[PDB]
Amino acid sequence: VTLCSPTEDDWPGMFLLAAASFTDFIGPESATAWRTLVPTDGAVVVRDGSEVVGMALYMDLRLTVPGEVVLPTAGLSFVAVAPTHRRRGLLRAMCAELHRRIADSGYPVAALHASEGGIYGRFGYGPATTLHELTVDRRFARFHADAPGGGLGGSSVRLVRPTEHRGEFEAIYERWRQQVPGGLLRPQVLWDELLAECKAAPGGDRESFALLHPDGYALYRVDRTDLKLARVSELRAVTADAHCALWRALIGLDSMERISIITHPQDPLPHLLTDTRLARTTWRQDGLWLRIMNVPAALEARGYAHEVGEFSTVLEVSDGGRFALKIGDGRARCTPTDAAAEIEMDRDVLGSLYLGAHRASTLAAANRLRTKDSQLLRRLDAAFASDVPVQTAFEF
Amino acid sequence: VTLCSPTEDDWPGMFLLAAASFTDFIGPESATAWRTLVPTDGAVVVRDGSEVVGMALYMDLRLTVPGEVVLPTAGLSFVAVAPTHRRRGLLRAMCAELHRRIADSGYPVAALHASEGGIYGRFGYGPATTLHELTVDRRFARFHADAPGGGLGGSSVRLVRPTEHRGEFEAIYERWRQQVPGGLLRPQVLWDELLAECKAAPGGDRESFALLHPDGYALYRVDRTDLKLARVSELRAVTADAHCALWRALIGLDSMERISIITHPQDPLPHLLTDTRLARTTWRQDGLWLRIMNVPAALEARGYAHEVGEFSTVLEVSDGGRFALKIGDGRARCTPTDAAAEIEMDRDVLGSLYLGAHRASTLAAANRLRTKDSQLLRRLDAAFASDVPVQTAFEF
Amino acid sequence: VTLCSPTEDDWPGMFLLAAASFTDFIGPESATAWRTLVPTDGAVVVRDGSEVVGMALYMDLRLTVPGEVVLPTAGLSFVAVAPTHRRRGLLRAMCAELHRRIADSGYPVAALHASEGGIYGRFGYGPATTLHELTVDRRFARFHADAPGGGLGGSSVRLVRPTEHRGEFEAIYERWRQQVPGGLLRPQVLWDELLAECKAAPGGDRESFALLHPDGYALYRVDRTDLKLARVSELRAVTADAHCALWRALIGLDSMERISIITHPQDPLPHLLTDTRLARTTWRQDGLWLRIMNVPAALEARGYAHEVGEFSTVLEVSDGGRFALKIGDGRARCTPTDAAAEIEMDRDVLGSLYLGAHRASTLAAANRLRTKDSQLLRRLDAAFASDVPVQTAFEF
Amino acid sequence: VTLCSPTEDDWPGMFLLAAASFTDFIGPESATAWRTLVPTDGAVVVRDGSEVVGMALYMDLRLTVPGEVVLPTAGLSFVAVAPTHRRRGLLRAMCAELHRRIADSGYPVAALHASEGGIYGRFGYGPATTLHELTVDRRFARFHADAPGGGLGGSSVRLVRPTEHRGEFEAIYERWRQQVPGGLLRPQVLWDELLAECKAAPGGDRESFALLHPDGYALYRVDRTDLKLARVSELRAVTADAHCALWRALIGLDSMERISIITHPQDPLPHLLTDTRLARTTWRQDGLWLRIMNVPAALEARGYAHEVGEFSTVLEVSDGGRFALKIGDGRARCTPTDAAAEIEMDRDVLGSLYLGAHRASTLAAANRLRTKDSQLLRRLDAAFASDVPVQTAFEF
Ligand SMILES: CC(C)(COP(=O)(O)OP(=O)(O)OC[C@H]1O[C@@H](n2cnc3c(N)ncnc32)[C@H](O)[C@@H]1OP(=O)(O)O)[C@@H](O)C(=O)NCCC(=O)NCCS
Numbered sequence A, B, C, D: 001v002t003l004c005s006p007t008e009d010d011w012p013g014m015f016l017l018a019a020a021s022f023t024d025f026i027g028p029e030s031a032t033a034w035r036t037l038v039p040t041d042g043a044v045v046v047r048d049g050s051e052v053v054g055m056a057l058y059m060d061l062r063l064t065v066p067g068e069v070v071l072p073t074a075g076l077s078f079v080a081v082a083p084t085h086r087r088r089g090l091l092r093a094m095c096a097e098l099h100r101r102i103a104d105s106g107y108p109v110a111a112l113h114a115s116e117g118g119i120y121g122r123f124g125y126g127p128a129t130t131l132h133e134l135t136v137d138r139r140f141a142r143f144h145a146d147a148p149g150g151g152l153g154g155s156s157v158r159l160v161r162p163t164e165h166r167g168e169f170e171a172i173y174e175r176w177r178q179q180v181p182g183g184l185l186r187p188q189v190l191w192d193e194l195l196a197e198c199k200a201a202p203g204g205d206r207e208s209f210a211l212l213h214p215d216g217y218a219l220y221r222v223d224r225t226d227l228k229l230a231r232v233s234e235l236r237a238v239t240a241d242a243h244c245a246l247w248r249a250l251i252g253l254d255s256m257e258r259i260s261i262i263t264h265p266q267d268p269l270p271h272l273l274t275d276t277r278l279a280r281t282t283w284r285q286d287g288l289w290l291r292i293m294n295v296p297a298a299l300e301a302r303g304y305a306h307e308v309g310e311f312s313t314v315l316e317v318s319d320g321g322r323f324a325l326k327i328g329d330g331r332a333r334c335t336p337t338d339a340a341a342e343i344e345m346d347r348d349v350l351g352s353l354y355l356g357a358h359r360a361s362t363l364a365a366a367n368r369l370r371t372k373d374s375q376l377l378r379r380l381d382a383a384f385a386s387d388v389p390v391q392t393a394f395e396f
């Protein structure tokens, strides 16, 4: 068993492993497009002795974090070990090598979407965003008297074919992704792929439509089996006005009984309605997971809440160093120290804290972050909160 | 149609209306026990011309709010209008009269549990707690290396019959309710009623068991139809250690596939496990709803976050007054003013903010709270947050 | 194997057979009450050699037929053959004997409710009423501007406990049963039994309520398993105004999503609504079945439509005689003849025609009634129609 | 917002709206074929200011009504308003304009199939046919001794490929449509479309087969998901013999458990079987809806029942005129009058009465048709009945 970077001749064997490991496998043509985002030396394979029995890679991404700061981010993906070679340490070996390459290349953070919740904690990944599915019975939905844009006159929203309005979707998305933590840059090849998914499929998915506003859009399609359900695949709103107008239009889809969307826990949609209960939470799951590769670089890059007064502490990350951390005026300085730790946590826990999706106080109640100072805990909680709620961009 | 306080002769007609309006109607014997909590003049009925066609009442409660402050609280309940007399304004009339009585009696807040989400917003009630059902497939559940109490030696938890340990449940609950916002005092009659529900029912509910720790307890029973599901009706933990020990024991219920509980969004349970995803959010709903009866009294009673620096603003509640509000050092002072409002909201919105379950920033994105100052919004968000996560006590 | 009238010592063996043959077996106490309606010599049993292996009986009923005419009617019931003695001709033997007794006793018609649709056709029973279940999603239901009783002021309907209003239900029902074909007299013992079913059952059925109008009533209860479904067990309306008022009240049952009732195909309910489609036909089945025992007596007893001009024909019933039939001015005269038949049908077919539930033209298209004269067919169709739609009274 | 007839450049925008409004949208190629039936000026669009936000059209049809009379009929279809422009009166505007065009063009009636039951009543459309789904468990089905064509010798029915027998289907259908009320002429383009649906679809519908008799045919296919269900899409029988022979053959489909068909309430199928209950009514719904455009023209065109003696009345249609109506010898004469009305009804109600699907007595019990004369009501009921049961042709 050898571990190395794949040559062009390894890729058919990788695509086989992928087809056999991922039911949603996008196929060799789409995989070849995503492949443009994998840098030289961004992939590893394990060969038996010959054939590929393990693989893993990362893609070059740009991730927005609190304070509208954009970080270069290694997006781990296409990770698989053949059923014939599992529980033999191949994943451990591949992850160790890629993390070494990622850290040496100067990425401050790595990220992934997890096939199961039990795999990546041990490799230092913590779930950093939360997927929150809302399902609205639009037959009962009425907008609150307070909701923006209720009066007479035309709508600002147009029903359009997605493929005819690429330029506009690109520009709205680019605005959205820079202002929301969790935002990812979407390169040209991924827009190529996205807009190709919009067509009706040979007995597969039904046609996708779009609702377009100057400051937001929604892409949606009728569910394949539940013909009275419209599934919104993506709703990107730069303003509260755009968000409300788009929901007014979606709730106007008279042929549907239900509209669903995978969104974030702070989606204001329920508060737009006279009956908040009509926007039902029907599913909840971890979205993006984060591994902080360089503790000081990541902590100094992010913005912090201005409300909390300046404070100083000593943070130990379990195998990631001990640091004097000073947070004041929305900024952190994070320097080496051998002073006694006041806060201790595993690396995965820092990842969970990093985009504001999980409170330090909650992690502390589970003993995942240890301190004896309850005031310090309150201060950390407040500082690490994100003013702009964290959202999930696209799966990779 | 006359509206007045019921005489002893009206109660059989009220119990009829109740039986016909509430499928979960507790029955006349149990209703007669809850009745001990309804003060003189705490009930209204509407009679046709004669028979009761409408009813509503409130119970005297004690509710814990952020800062461990306990407020006298009017708990609205038993609200119904006969199917023969609906959409005729009887609810409006009954609510107007009870609110007048409640305000005059000196209650700063009223509260209820809503049969539907669309009814009470217009009467100034905002949803103030969130019910969050977690379901754990205990066959896969493993505790994290960090989780408290993993080593050898006896458990601190005992499997007991609930009815044999009333005194201990009472004392743990009394500790719990004083320290958690959302906490309600549970009078003797409600413990009488609770412990009577513990017995196996003639073809009804299965026997209830209890898991008892010095600092917490869990009451649970096997689901009537899904024999591999244990439903936890109530888990009251005063310490993180008690919470973890109780979950260790529940997850040890080898005969079960699944354990479910209706809990709060910040329950640390998922973080206790090696796979956070195993604690699945299977249902979400508004719990307790709040109507702030006296704006200055309520705002001055609550504690605020210490992290936010002192600030002053002018808050207008839509039909509830305009106030100079100064928040500093964890405390608010809230005085009459005719100065220009900086923040405006309907009364229901203040109720939603009051226990920290909903962020001002989220309500603002839906235009339910209006300000032009984004800094002020951040400050309000931080100040109104509850350090101790809000929980739901018992339904009434 | 002997066939005779049961002695008092046979009844425990009959009740055993019944318990084993009917899942809905009402039990020995209720069966003993219905037993008061069985005349002397109204029952037969077959004994092996000793124990009862077959039984059948009839009850003395009064049935309303078109023209508001009431006929003495033998209601066959409690018919069963032990699983150990089936397909041996016991049913044939028992039916032959009871029919002989029924005919000799002077009943012009016999009736039953069928456990399956394939049994009784061969014994001369035709399905004579149609059960039609309507289910209304009351959340969407709005009454048409034309529907009676929409304005302001009190309702004429009261929500009551059934057991406290026996006298009123009895009097309304007695009016209803005399004016509707399919109507049956309900003796005191059956009101005793009915009103005993109204109580909540030990883990069984939920409590029954009643909606009472001076000219109609509805009895209903929440479904045992679907807690948002109200099932109307019986709605007896003497006027269109009573029918509408009762439906207004039922549709006011705010706690329910759905209201269902087993009714007749001409129930005007759907036409009361702005969306007729909301009253969904969810089940359809034969109700009452009729065997005409004496052809001339039955045909002369009934009223016929006045619209059709006088006409004369010759009707042959397959093993039931040939008759000169003259119908004019709403009345028939039906005398023996050996003239050539113009219309031929089996006895069961006449039963199906008799209350107006099935058209002669429809039976003729299936060759169940044979004539060569299409004008005669049209005339028969018109004459046999019932001006008042046929309804189903109660099961026996 | 402008309302006018579409130009050739509007049609891509209409097809977009259609795709977004109708899940069953037949597609641009099929829509372009149906388009041949839309006359010049038969369509309207509403444009924002530019893009289509509303559309509606009618097709030129021929509808058979009682008495085998064929009426030119405007078939409304392709009606939609964009989700961004709803509840703004666009439907009202479009319907007003098309009705003006339809009335001026000299059509006595308009017709449609309704997406929901609550839309068209207000525009004067009443449901005029009833869809009645029967499902037969063919494993138990046995034909009655009376049913036509039971003896030995070959069947008159052949199992064929639909596309190889177009000429024969056309001729049988043309006979059927002229003799049944509800019948519609099926132009060549619709046979083109129909026979193209017969092929197996790329993962879609399974292959369609046909059963062919000289006087009738049935088209059917196995259900896509329930492989033991055969769904009959269309059964057109000119004789009772053809109807029975076709059902004998369908019930011979040994590979199937169930056969279903959407048929009419008077389908004689159940009476063909020894157990009528085996032909289960599994769904019921309004089919064709009618708006009578010219009251006197429509009432004089139809045939009436000969059985009812000559009578004269005065009928007021709510915004449709008042008429002296004389019906005798199967014919009506309907002339202007200002004499006092004896019968009053909204226009939609007349549409419901017109093909004999609904009884005047039933509409009257719901107060949808008002008279004080119960004899007059009986006479109207009898006169408006259709001797040949009304059927539904094809959806448009
Ligand atoms: C997940 C997967 C890559 C693991 O590969 P592997 O070579 O068998 O893993 P390793 O042998 O290196 O195991 C490393 C550790 O992770 C653990 N582990 C691996 N997969 C796990 C999972 N699904 N859940 C919980 N633990 C897991 C092992 O128990 C082991 O623990 P240990 O160090 O205490 O002994 C593999 O099962 C696979 O290809 N799955 C199918 C596709 C997939 O889901 N890939 C991941 C996409 S995000």
Ligand SMILES: CC(C)(COP(=O)(O)OP(=O)(O)OC[C@H]1O[C@@H](n2cnc3c(N)ncnc32)[C@H](O)[C@@H]1OP(=O)(O)O)[C@@H](O)C(=O)NCCC(=O)NCCS
Residues within 6 Å of the ligand: B021, B022, B079, B080, B081, B082, B085, B086, B087, B088, B089, B090, B091, B092, B093, B113, B114, B115, B116, B118, B119, C254, C255
């Ligand atoms: C909810 C209930 C008490 C309402 O009584 P009512 O007398 O018909 O209400 P009113 O006539 O006074 O209506 C007042 C307003 O509330 C609205 N309203 C009442 N119930 C509502 C509901 N279920 N959802 C949304 N709006 C509702 C009315 O539309 C009306 O609005 P308007 O002021 O704009 O006209 C009644 O339907 C009932 O008894 N329900 C069954 C039992 C129940 O659920 N009770 C509540 C327990 S929390």
Ligand SMILES: CC(C)(COP(=O)(O)OP(=O)(O)OC[C@H]1O[C@@H](n2cnc3c(N)ncnc32)[C@H](O)[C@@H]1OP(=O)(O)O)[C@@H](O)C(=O)NCCC(=O)NCCS
Residues within 6 Å of the ligand: C021, C022, C079, C080, C081, C082, C085, C086, C087, C088, C089, C090, C091, C092, C093, C113, C114, C115, C116, C118, C119
């Ligand atoms: C229905 C029941 C009474 C029949 O008794 P039985 O003694 O086996 O019937 P017989 O032997 O006299 O059969 C007489 C004819 O009826 C037919 N038959 C009996 N039950 C039938 C049924 N369920 N469906 C169709 N045909 C049936 C027999 O095939 C026979 O036909 P044949 O004359 O061509 O040979 C019996 O099966 C029974 O007790 N069922 C359970 C309870 C029940 O449903 N009772 C009827 C309440 S309405």
Ligand SMILES: CC(C)(COP(=O)(O)OP(=O)(O)OC[C@H]1O[C@@H](n2cnc3c(N)ncnc32)[C@H](O)[C@@H]1OP(=O)(O)O)[C@@H](O)C(=O)NCCC(=O)NCCS
Residues within 6 Å of the ligand: A254, A255, D021, D022, D079, D080, D081, D082, D085, D086, D087, D088, D089, D090, D091, D092, D093, D113, D114, D115, D116, D118, D119
């Ligand atoms: C049905 C549809 C065409 C209505 O368009 P619209 O422009 O919003 O309707 P309007 O604004 O002109 O409303 C006219 C009236 O009809 C009512 N109405 C419209 N659709 C209705 C429906 N689905 N159910 C009940 N009432 C409806 C409105 O409430 C309004 O009533 P009012 O006069 O008392 O105010 C639209 O919702 C639509 O495109 N639906 C999707 C496709 C479809 O089903 N089309 C119909 C095919 S038969």
